[PDB]
């Protein structure tokens, strides 16, 4: 059931010999089930992988590093201390020789290091050492804004300084091996964009001085997030916290704890809600999951009408009072080989059964990735200007009009990094080639 806009990217990347197809575009529906119809289409000869448990659970997928078998720390260039082949009848060498395409959801989070250890991974254990990625057609995914690794400090950030320069997917020297085919996105709605504040975002993001004073001289309003149907985006899920549990203390009805059934293998951290969730009539919560069904989807706003032991009642603010929720299971999936003729099977290790719910007074960027908000009030915390960690935040909204913002911003905040800026003008042709 893909549109004409997922079937264009599917079918020029799904036929073609070369391997390497990077796809561009904002989180949220279709291009979730853009991924779901790839994975199904290879269904037996590929794994969905990400960089991360989150993006892991979300993608129907597994860690690259749980996969590979990769260590938890800096991946030193074709290494093999780091980068350890699986060896002769390994459960894993069995299911990258017989594997033709791997699908990498979220790239953006993926550091270079990382890339370069599933290249002489692949080639390592499939005899194509002179092919990139052993000639396994490489499927990267997901907005390549949504940044930055996370780089320590000390010897390990002179390592990626010497070896590739910086720690992000692009420097990776495979891409002088191999060109990029870029499949671009974000027409999913054109001028529910506000091309001005397009255009605005661009000035922000190169630095542009009078732009940011256009945007604190619109924007500025001390704590409106008071206004009726505003979202309180806070950058630190800390501080989300405690402004959901202020709101939901004010509410006088009873509370209801939720009890998540965490069955096999399931890392706390990658627990997609509060797996002790307390809620109270006239909360306000957001969905997490596609409903099977139909009538509700996944990041949908509503309140808390009714509260009961394994279902509950949320008014939906998109158009009200229709859907009654019930416990989801979420399944921690890890590809493997089986002999059933000779080939990957995605077996499910772990389970969290929970409501898809979570309280939604206040968010975080985190968790409001590709979400088309209403009106949205940002709160800032004197310092995020972690080299432009904020240019997320201010995307979560077509129009200018609909951002409120607590404190004015730094012209820090929002400047894009060198290589970045670089990176997605370079993108902007097509094919994207590593010179030099």
Known sequence: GLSSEQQRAFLAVTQTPHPAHLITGPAGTGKTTL????????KGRAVTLAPTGTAALQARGQ??????????????????????????????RKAIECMEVLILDEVGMVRVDLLEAMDWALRKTRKRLEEPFGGVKVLLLGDT???EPVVPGGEEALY????????????AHVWEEVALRVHRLWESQRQREDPLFAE???????????????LNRAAVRPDGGEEPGTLILTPRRKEADALNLKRLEALPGKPLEYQAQVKGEFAETDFPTEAALTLKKGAQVILLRNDPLGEYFNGDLGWVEDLEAEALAVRLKRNG???????????????????????????????????????AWALTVHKAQGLTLDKVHLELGRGLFAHGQLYVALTRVRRLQDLSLSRPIAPTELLWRPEVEVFETRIQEGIWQKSH
């Open 63 to 92: 860690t690259v590093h749980s996969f590979f078998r990769f260590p938890a720390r800096l991946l030193r260039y074709r290494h093999p201390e780091d980068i350890r082949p699986p060896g002769p009848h390994s459960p894993l």
């Open 160 to 171: 990626i300084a010497r070896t590739w320069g910086g720690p992000f997917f692009f420097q």
């Open 35 to 42: 991924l779901y119809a790839l994975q199904k289409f290879y």
């Open 145 to 147: 804004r949504q940044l």
């Open 321 to 359: 009072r229709r859907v009654v929720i019930r416990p989801f299971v979420w399944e921690k999936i890890v590809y493997t080989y089986d002999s059933e003729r000779e080939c990957i099977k995605p077996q499910v290790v772990g389970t969290f059964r929970q409501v898809p719910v979570r309280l």
């Open 200 to 214: 605005l975002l661009k000035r922000l993001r190169q630095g542009d001085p009078q732009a940011l004073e256009t």
